[PDB]
From a paper:
Cyclin-dependent kinase 7 (Cdk7) is required in cell-cycle and transcriptional regulation owing to its function as both a CDK-activating kinase (CAK) and part of transcription factor TFIIH. Cdk7 forms active complexes by associating with Cyclin H and Mat1, and is regulated by two phosphorylations in the activation segment (T loop): the canonical activating modification at T170 and another at S164. Cdk7 directly influences progression of the cell cycle by phosphorylating and hence activating cell-cycle kinases Cdk1, Cdk2, Cdk4, and Cdk6.
Doubly phosphorylated, fully active CAK complexes were crystallized in the presence of ADP•Mg2+ and a chaperoning nanobody, VHHRD7-04. Two Cdk7/Cyclin H/Mat1230-309/VHHRD7-04 heterotetramers constitute the asymmetrical unit cell of the protein crystal, exhibiting a high overall similarity at an RMSD value of 0.28 Å over 624 Cα atoms. Cyclin H residues D116 and E117 that form intermolecular contacts are located at the tip of helix H3 and constitute a di-acidic motif that is highly conserved in cyclins. The second, Cdk7-specific phospho-site pS164 is buried in the tripartite complex formed with Cyclin H and Mat1. It forms a salt bridge with R165 of the second cyclin box of Cyclin H, which in turn is in a linear arrangement to form another intermolecular salt bridge with D299 of Mat1.
Numbering used by the authors:
A (entry chain A): 46 to 311
B (entry chain B): 1 to 287
C (entry chain C): 244 to 308
D (entry chain D): 1 to 114
The structure:
Amino acid sequence: GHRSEAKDGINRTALREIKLLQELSHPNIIGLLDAFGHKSNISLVFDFMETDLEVIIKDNSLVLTPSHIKAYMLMTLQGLEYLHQHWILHRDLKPNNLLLDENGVLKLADFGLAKSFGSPNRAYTHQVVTRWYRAPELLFGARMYGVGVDMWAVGCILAELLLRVPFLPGDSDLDQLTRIFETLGTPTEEQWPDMCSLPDYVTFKSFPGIPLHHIFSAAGDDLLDLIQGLFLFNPCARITATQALKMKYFSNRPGPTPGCQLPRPN
Amino acid sequence: MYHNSSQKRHWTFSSEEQLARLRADANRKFRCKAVANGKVLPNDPVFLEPHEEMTLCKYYEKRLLEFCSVFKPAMPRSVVGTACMYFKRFYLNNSVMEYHPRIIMLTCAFLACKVDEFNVSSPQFVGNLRESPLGQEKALEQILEYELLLIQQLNFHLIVHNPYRPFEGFLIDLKTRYPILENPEILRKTADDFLNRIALTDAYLLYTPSQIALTAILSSASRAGITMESYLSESLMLKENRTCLSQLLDIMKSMRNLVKKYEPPRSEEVAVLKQKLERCHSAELAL
Amino acid sequence: ALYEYQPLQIETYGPHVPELEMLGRLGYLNHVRAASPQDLAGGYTSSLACHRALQDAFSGLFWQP
Amino acid sequence: QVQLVESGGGLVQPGGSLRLSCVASGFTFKNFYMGWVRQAPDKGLEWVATINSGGEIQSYADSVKGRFTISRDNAKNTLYLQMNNLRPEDTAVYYCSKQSSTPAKGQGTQVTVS
């Protein structure tokens, strides 16, 4: 781990967006329309989007029906499934980075933290993903991880869809861990066996947690089943984007709202 | 992934002749530009021939390989293959007479360290140059000046697929499904040397990284006197599609011929051409 | 219209990469470095390294420009 | 009181097969992710397999991938682990585990592969 600025030339974060989005093409992933520079400065141009998921969540006048939420989750997981099949982690999923065009098409956007994964010879930064959406293995300092770092954030986005409020708003890395454990319970070794081996692992008081059906009173069994799989503590057992799309929640009767019928913020 | 990559879509060409035409095209354009500036005549012997630009590119490519092998922070192999790929692509459409290969080969390695996420600081990078701290800073300034230019000449296609990971994939498949080859690890030594040989040819611009890696393995098996045609027909199931088995066998023969006819740059010829190239820059033909 | 899962179909121009469950029972994972408990704790498994190496090896094997 | 009762263990030869059962009681079995964990002597706990509440998705450890199959019958409140092509390294005590929320683990059944 190293770098700097001002004498390193072109911003490495912008190079991440260029090098990755130049290899990807999917309806639910933002498209790079133009890139240009001048004297180690660089500028990127993307598809013109109308709004993002955060303003939709914050719009008190906007009513989120079960069909609306299913459509947002479907498009998010479809773009994320494409990402993971090309061995790329987004590592910054949040409502800010889920943009919607004028036709109700959701696209993953900020790839400044995205990175390829799957290689055993590469070490990975654990200080990724915005704190409120960061998986516990990252808070425990994991330098080798997988798709769970995205799926945990997807669970926090779905929880913010249902609650219209940040699910786990930690003030610090330790406060984020307390909120995770006092809300979902503290994992035992049977639920996360090698958890103690993580570089920045810290032992917490055993909290029982709040039952999911109490946290999400408006969710049915199929939706509760999906949420539970996204928040499994074991990062190897936590469901993948493909597994999430194959769950009964997405194929059940309420169905997803078409893109042209999704609500448009005020 | 390669099968839908920009490398496959825009930077994999059909023939050596296409590569030669692009390089001769870059050489001719610089000549026209220099003559247009009214300093030189259309056939001034200061101009380098396309075959002389190639000899200098072979030389500075080996110097780039040598620079990476001694890089103080141990450099991953994927950074080196990415940097060499950048170097090949740049002088496909540019002349060594306009942008000096010495500065460009360092910019390729500098950019490859960022793209591949091999995070070294700028002083850590130029610290590997055996020059004074006065000169190491001058080299860094020139690298930052050519950095944007390199990305433009690559059409902002930065991801390079190397044959190193495909090489490991076949070994896993060999160790798993091909017991006929007892201990596939015996081939790694010779296949690695064969792999390094094709890296100096234009094979990176003509073949897929998977074909390159399989060629190195099967060639090493041929050296060890080991038959493994059944790995292609039976294990890779090319018994079904005979036209694809035929194409792949032709691709591997073409690659082995690329290495057979590779001409290393002679040291005396490099000395002459470096002298001519240096005179070409000092006259400042650009303007 | 209701939703039903359809797998994404992308041409690899190469041999068939074994399914994830075949990696275990056919012994593919015997020939990749075993993941340390610190790796399993973060989610990294040996099947990740094995699968990507297999995919990169077969990707574009049959593609000719 | 919560209770998980494993059964089905025994001595099996290399390459043989065994199915383990786990009868759950004291909680709403259908509403929880369930899983299997195993512990061999002089070795730490090893996650084996997990299945969701609805049962349509499963996840397996690399060491048992392609050989084991986890399933559940929510009507009978039982969890299953089909084990095929058993190897000597599969020898361990096998435990049914509540993989979500309040933790629960049974007493364990011994599987021995010679």
